[PDB]
Amino acid sequence: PQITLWKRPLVTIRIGGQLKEALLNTGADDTVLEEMNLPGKWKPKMIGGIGGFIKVRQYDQIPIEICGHKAIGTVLVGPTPVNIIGRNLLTQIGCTLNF
Amino acid sequence: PQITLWKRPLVTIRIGGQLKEALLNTGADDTVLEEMNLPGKWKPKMIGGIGGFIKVRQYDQIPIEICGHKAIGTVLVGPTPVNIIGRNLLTQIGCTLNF
């Protein structure tokens, strides 16, 4: 689809069998979800945002369906204010900016 | 133009006739620039995201050009780690997400 930006670009994702709402975020290197359980091994990581740094859990090679498009990649879990699909997975689903 | 998301979508902007690089950020409601001593009246504001909040100065009806496309609106200034173009200006230049 083509998504304009008068509102937040929120879409439905499916991850670990569950549905969530997430923001398509070209300002994020990485994908970061609010605290949730995911299967498999994880590693502690830190990431930075507008307000400073936070601790997250890094899960590799996690399948996620984003607005109907399949991706499999790294998902960070932690105290983000909103679920965030970042560039790592935006590229997988063929997303570009256009003006 | 079309901007792919393999790398941070950093583009050239012009503010006060002077050039800066800035991040096209569909995950930002508002536009925030790295500390610079811009003239004019401003109001204090707090903006937040990952990591918490930072204090910024809110300037109104500031002309900005983004990759050659003219815009005018509210520009925030403060200790962001990178210049950020948010949706308030991305909508003015007709920027869309496409996949």
């Binding site: 994020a28 290197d29 930075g48 | 925030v32 937040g48 995201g49 950020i84």
Partner: peptide, 10 residues
């Protein structure tokens, strides 16, 4: 409300 979701790897 929090509205700027910049995110950077460390």
């Amino acid at each position: 409300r929090p509205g700027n979701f910049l995110q950077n790897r460390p």
